[PDB]
Structures are given as structure tokens and as C-alpha cells.
């Protein structure tokens, strides 16, 4: 739910 993009 936060910016879980690597």
C-alpha cells in the first residue's frame, strides 16, 4: 500500500 515499486 505505500510505493511498493522496487
Amino acid at each position, epitope marked *: *500500500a*505505500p*510505493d*511498493c*515499486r*522496487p
Partner: single-chain antibody
Amino acid sequence: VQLQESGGGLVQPGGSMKLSCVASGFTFSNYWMNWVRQSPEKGLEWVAEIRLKSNNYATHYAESVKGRFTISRDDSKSSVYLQMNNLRAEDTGIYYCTGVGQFAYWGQGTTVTVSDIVVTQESALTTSPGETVTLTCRSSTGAVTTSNYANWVQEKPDHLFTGLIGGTNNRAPGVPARFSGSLIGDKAALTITGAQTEDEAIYFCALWYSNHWVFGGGTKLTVLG
């Protein structure tokens, strides 16, 4: 990757100030950006986030600054901004732009001088080179789980921050293999398998709670001999 803040300085209580941060070395527009501030008394404190163009640039704010600060971004200039109105003494601190999975990258900070969930970490731990040491991070709400997206951030001498772990268990790029993050029991945990002298630092965890981050008070890790 560089993030580089500017705009800090002296402001009178009730006054306004705009901070800027320019990003390079990563695809800025693909990542959310945050402002986090560090004070003498209140420690590390998350201020604001701004999401992507596909999220209609949605913003969220700490309760302490809601209604006084506005975060924004210009993807065309790879920059994020913090407009701050009605400043108070409690707003004094060093302000950092930071982001990526979720706090891999930190700028150098810009100082602003004006004039409830608790995350708990060990105050201090002492180790020696080659030992295995585990730092922990507890939430006042219950268990830490993957939904808290635990991050671990290292502070080295004089306010230099680098993210080590995000999303509970994911080493940021270029982070040494001796660092790992996990959940242990009902807490987030940072393990250093074979501590090294240069690992002497303050380590902060941050946990996500739906729409905001809460940082722990930090653990001072001393590495003796």
C-alpha cells in the same frame, strides 16, 4: 542516484518557506516522493508524500503539518517541492527528500530554523566485528506484518542517511549482503550477519500505517574492537 535539497534557512514564526529537491539517476516520475525531517527533540519524522501522475498526484501529510504544508512535484524537472506556511518552533529541523522502495535514497538535507502511534526500537546495542546482531522494531498498534512495509535506514556521522531495507525484506541497490530484513515474531528486524566496524551508526525503522509512516526513535549500534 542523487537527491539534492535546497531552500532552507532562517524563518520567523508564522512565516513561509519553500524547499526544492532535484533527483537524478533514477526514473523520478515512476516513484512516490517524501519529505522527512530530523529534529533535536522529535527525531526522524515523516512529513508528506506525493504519489504518481497515474494517482492524480495524490498527497498525504503528517497530522502535525496538515493544513500548513503543501508537497508538489514537477516530473518535467525531476523535482519535488515542499511549501511550508504559518511555521512554528516545532518545525525547526533538517528536511530530506527521500524515496524508492521506500526510503532507499536520501538527499543531504536542508536546514529550516524557525525563529498516536509509537514505533519502538532498542536505544542501543553493542557488538563486535564478526558477530550477528539483530535490531528490532515494534508497533504500539500490535503485530508488524508485511502490510507495514518495514524500512530500515542507516544514519552515518552527521545526518547522512541511506536506506538499507524496504518492504520488510528487500535490500536496496548496492547494500552489502550482510544486512537483511525480516519479521521476527511480531516485530520487524534488521540482521547484520558479521558486523563490521563501519557499521557503527544509528539505525531507524519506519512502519506504514494505511496512509502515513511512523519512524522509530533509532538504535545506536556500537561496534567494539
